[PDB]
Amino acid sequence: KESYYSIGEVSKLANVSIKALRYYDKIDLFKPAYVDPDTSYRYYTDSQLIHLDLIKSLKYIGTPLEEMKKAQDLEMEELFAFYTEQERQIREKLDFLSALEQTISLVKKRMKRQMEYPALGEVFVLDEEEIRIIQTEAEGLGPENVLNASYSKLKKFIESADGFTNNSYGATFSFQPYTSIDEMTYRHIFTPVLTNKQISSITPDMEITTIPKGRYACIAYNFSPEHYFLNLQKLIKYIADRQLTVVSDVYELIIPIHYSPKKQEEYRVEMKIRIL
Amino acid sequence: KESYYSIGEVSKLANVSIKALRYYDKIDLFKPAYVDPDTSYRYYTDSQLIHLDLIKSLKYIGTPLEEMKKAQDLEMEELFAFYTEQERQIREKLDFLSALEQTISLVKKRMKRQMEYPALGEVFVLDEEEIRIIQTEAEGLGPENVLNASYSKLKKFIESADGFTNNSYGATFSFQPYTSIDEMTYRHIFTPVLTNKQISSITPDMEITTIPKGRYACIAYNFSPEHYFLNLQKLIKYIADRQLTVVSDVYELIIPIHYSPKKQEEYRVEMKIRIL
DNA sequence: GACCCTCCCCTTAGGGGAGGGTC
DNA sequence: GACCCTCCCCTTAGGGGAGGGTC
Numbered sequence: 001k002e003s004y005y006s007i008g009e010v011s012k013l014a015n016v017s018i019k020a021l022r023y024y025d026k027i028d029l030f031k032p033a034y035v036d037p038d039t040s041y042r043y044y045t046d047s048q049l050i051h052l053d054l055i056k057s058l059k060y061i062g063t064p065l066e067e068m069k070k071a072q073d074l075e076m077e078e079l080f081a082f083y084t085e086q087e088r089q090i091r092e093k094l095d096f097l098s099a100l101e102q103t104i105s106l107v108k109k110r111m112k113r114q115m116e117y118p119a120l121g122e123v124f125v126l127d128e129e130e131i132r133i134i135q136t137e138a139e140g141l142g143p144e145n146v147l148n149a150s151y152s153k154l155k156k157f158i159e160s161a162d163g164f165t166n167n168s169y170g171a172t173f174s175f176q177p178y179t180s181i182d183e184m185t186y187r188h189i190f191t192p193v194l195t196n197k198q199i200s201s202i203t204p205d206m207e208i209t210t211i212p213k214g215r216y217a218c219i220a221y222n223f224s225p226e227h228y229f230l231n232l233q234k235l236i237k238y239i240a241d242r243q244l245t246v247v248s249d250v251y252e253l254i255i256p257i258h259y260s261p262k263k264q265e266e267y268r269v270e271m272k273i274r275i276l
Numbered sequence: 277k278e279s280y281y282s283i284g285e286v287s288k289l290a291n292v293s294i295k296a297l298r299y300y301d302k303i304d305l306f307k308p309a310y311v312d313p314d315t316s317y318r319y320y321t322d323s324q325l326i327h328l329d330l331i332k333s334l335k336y337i338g339t340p341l342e343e344m345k346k347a348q349d350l351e352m353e354e355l356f357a358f359y360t361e362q363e364r365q366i367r368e369k370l371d372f373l374s375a376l377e378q379t380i381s382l383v384k385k386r387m388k389r390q391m392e393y394p395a396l397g398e399v400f401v402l403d404e405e406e407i408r409i410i411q412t413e414a415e416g417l418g419p420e421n422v423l424n425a426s427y428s429k430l431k432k433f434i435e436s437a438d439g440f441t442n443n444s445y446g447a448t449f450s451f452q453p454y455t456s457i458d459e460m461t462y463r464h465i466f467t468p469v470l471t472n473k474q475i476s477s478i479t480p481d482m483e484i485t486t487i488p489k490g491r492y493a494c495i496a497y498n499f500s501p502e503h504y505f506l507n508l509q510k511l512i513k514y515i516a517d518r519q520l521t522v523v524s525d526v527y528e529l530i531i532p533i534h535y536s537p538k539k540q541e542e543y544r545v546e547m548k549i550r551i552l
Numbered sequence: 553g554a555c556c557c558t559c560c561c562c563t564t565a566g567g568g569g570a571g572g573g574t575c
Numbered sequence: 576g577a578c579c580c581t582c583c584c585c586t587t588a589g590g591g592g593a594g595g596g597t598c
């Protein structure tokens with residue numbers, strides 16, 4: 001009333017740290033009514049305390065300080081609108097988070113499917129849900145010369161729309177009595193798509209399609225070069241043996257087991273193909 | 277394949293800024309396979325490119341870099357769990373935002389009611405919805421000696437639970453044939469409560485109650501000292517004139533018109549009282 | 553003994569840009 | 576001509592703490 005609060009007294013009173021008050025002073029956001037000209041001590045009036053209501057509420061909303069100065073000024077009608085602004089900045093973040101949560105939940109669903117493989121290196125025929133994908137012509141690439149850079153573009157499209165990177169790298173090819181890896185080419189390469197955020201500015205050299213619901217002969221294993229062809233060969237036999245009728249390319253997918261560079265590179269591979 | 281990508285080549289390929297790559301190198305998060313010992317030029321292999329999938333996905337989730345190093349290591353089963361962690365950190369933020377949005381939307385509703393006052397300095401009798409509040413005994417305070425610091429405690433309780441600060445400061449008192457402000461004391465002071473976040477560790481010297489749904493004689497005006505008592509007096513007359521029967525304390529509330537300290541302090545005041 | 557001062561140094565994740573030396 | 580290097584300086588909102596001088 002007829003004396004000043006000292007910075008401590010205010011901080012205790014306002015639930016705002018002493019160092020915060022100095023900062024708000026420094027940046028001319030909230031400043032001592034008085035400053036002792038000899039002790040540099042900061043003194044505060046009871047009535048000026050009200051300005052903190054705004055500063056604190058805003059801070060809690062996460063409005064940045066420089067923005068708060070602009071806000072101090074407005075009278076209610078104008079400050080109402082400011083609030084709407086935050087409200088719409090907040091609906092934005094939520095939308096982005098709900099999206100994010102749904103994505104993770106899917107990435108986790110795809111991951112579970114992996115560690116719940118029925119067995120490795122053995123051929124299992126299973127009933128599968130469809131996996132939306134985007135893909136591009138493999139332009140004379142096969143298993144032998146295909147690089148990560150090959151996927152630069154697909155990834156760039158899925159990143160813009162999903163913000164997550166495909167954990168996994170796919171290619172497809174013709175099911176054929178292959179006698180040598182030497183003699184395979186990929187028809188397409190591709191990656192799976194996770195969200196249904198309409199993908200911006202997609203180009204006519206990318207096709208969006210899916211690996212369709214249906215019965216599949218799969219085999220999966222942890223990659224090493226020797227095994228690659230031989231597992232494929234196993235599949236081929238599996239189908240021939242059962243006189244089974246194939247109805248798609250062979251799809252393959254490659255997933256890293258880890259991303260550490262302190263450990264040896266390791267991948268899970270899975271090969272599948274649709275059958276009647 | 278049999279040569280290196282240069283930092284530019286990678287950045288273009290990976291949609292990750294050149295300066296970012298240098299940073300990830302600096303902090304041993306992602307590091308050139310090779311560094312030319314004479315040009316300090318950073319060279320990268322096509323296969324190491326995969327580690328970026330994780331870095332980028334994570335970054336997008338907003339996982340902090342130092343955390344990413346820990347994450348690189350885990351094999352799927354362990355990294356699954358990491359994801360759950362984020363998922364639960366995200367459900368947290370949403371909960372906090374939905375809460376935040378609902379609060380703002382209320383603060384805005386209270387604000388509209390203000391600028392849609394029927395008129396100022398005139399007594400209007402209106403049908404009101406209830407306002408939950410928390411309050412404390414005014415310990416011999418009246419209009420003359422009441423300070424902001426008086427509300428230190430209420431505010432501290434509502435801040436912990438709402439995170440917003442009451443825009444408005446309330447007191448109540450006995451409706452009485454007052455002939456002088458000199459002769460009033462507040463029964464309680466109080467502030468309105470916004471959220472229904474259970475308020476932690478509330479103490480027995482605070483009562484939670486509401487200003488109840490009902491018919492009210494109100495007057496509201498922009499404060500100045502002369503007007504304060506005289507408006508009160510008007511209310512008193514209003515009731516006497518209509519032979520109206522009061523059924524509560526007089527409630528008053530004070531709201532700032534602005535929070536700028538570049539402008540003169542200004543408050544809206546409103547006084548009301550419940551009637552049959 | 554307690555409180556307040558000023559003035560270091562520190563933290564995230566790079567972007568901008570200057571002032572080289574390389575492809 | 577283009578690309579890459581290292582090494583300034585900069586940004587949010589203070590917290591920690593040292594090394595005073597004040598209540």
Ligand SMILES: COc1ccc(C[C@H](N)C(=O)N[C@H]2[C@@H](O)[C@H](n3cnc4c(N(C)C)ncnc43)O[C@@H]2CO)cc1
Nearest residue numbers: 143144146147148169170171223225228253254267326
């Ligand atoms: C690992 O990062 C990649 C690299 C390339 C791809 C593209 C493709 N899906 C694909 O077929 N990716 C797989 C493999 O086909 C291919 N690969 C690399 N080396 C060989 C090889 N020898 C060296 C004898 N024989 C057969 N395949 C080979 O590399 C990938 C596993 O490293 C996917 C992931």
Ligand SMILES: COc1ccc(C[C@H](N)C(=O)N[C@H]2[C@@H](O)[C@H](n3cnc4c(N(C)C)ncnc43)O[C@@H]2CO)cc1
Nearest residue numbers: 050419420422423424445446447499501504529530543
């Ligand atoms: C503004 O910040 C405050 C300060 C105190 C309060 C407490 C209380 N609700 C209350 O009655 N707050 C109101 C007013 O009652 C009181 N007030 C301040 N000065 C006077 C006065 N004279 C100086 C003659 N006469 C009557 N009332 C006065 O200050 C507040 C408006 O400034 C609320 C807001």
